[PDB]
């Protein structure tokens, strides 16, 4: 099976990528999230995520692609309001999202 996993990218001075359950229930609007779908890697950043989280999200996505997929996977960047169909096919319709936490 193609992998399905979700990483919460959160922090500021120290930013960490933590694996969380694949669900909208794991999302908030203050962090970035990487939905790894194997051949496609979705890099989603909340409207209130900060620059350190966004930069860490880009590093994590390229890391998965180059170092775990032999460079052979697409990274797709989306924001709130531009989520692609395949993301919604996996997670279901987008609900309201809570604010992030410090």
């Amino acid at each position, epitope marked *: 099976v193609v992998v399905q996993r979700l990483f919460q990218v959160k922090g500021r001075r120290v930013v960490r990528a933590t694996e969380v359950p694949v669900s909208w229930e794991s999302f908030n609007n203050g962090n970035c999230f990487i939905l790894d779908l194997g051949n496609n890697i979705h890099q989603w950043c909340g409207s209130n995520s900060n620059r350190y989280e966004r930069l860490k999200a880009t590093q994590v996505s390229k890391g998965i692609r180059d170092n775990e997929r032999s460079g052979r996977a*697409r990274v*797709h960047v989306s924001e709130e309001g531009t989520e692609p*169909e395949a993301m919604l096919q996996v997670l279901g319709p987008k609900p309201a999202l809570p604010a992030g936490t410090e």
Partner: nanobody, 126 residues
């Protein structure tokens, strides 16, 4: 989620055809769509693509100046108007969807398209 094409058939050289593809089923949003063609005995090759909103289009070399891709976002349909056909345009024509791409028109690479219709046959006589 579900793609079904229509409008192919047999046409004289120089003639026109209008293919259409219906998007049905569970759709949550708009998505990239494109048209490919498989000549008798060959592989699938890019013809044209169009972005989620229909605002941007992209065309293969052979399609420039002859074909027009469009979409009706209300009906969830995309069309390929093919004008001034010639015999080597004979192929099965497939509408495909790139559900992962968040913006822009489709790429020209078959492997970027994950959802496919069943295809409509197009024969150009001589």
């Amino acid at each position: 989620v579900q793609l079904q094409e229509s409008g192919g058939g047999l046409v004289q050289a120089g003639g026109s055809l209008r293919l259409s593809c219906a998007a049905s089923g569970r759709t949550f949003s708009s998505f990239v769509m494109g048209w490919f063609r498989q000549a008798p005995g060959k592989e699938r090759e890019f013809v044209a693509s169009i972005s989620r909103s229909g605002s941007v289009t992209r065309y293969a070399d052979s399609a420039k100046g002859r074909f027009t891709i469009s979409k009706d976002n209300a009906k969830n349909t995309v069309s390929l108007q093919m004008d001034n056909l010639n015999p080597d345009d004979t192929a099965v024509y497939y509408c495909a969807a790139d559900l992962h791409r968040p913006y822009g028109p489709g790429s020209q690479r078959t492997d970027d398209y994950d959802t496919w219709g069943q295809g409509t046959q197009v024969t150009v006589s001589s």
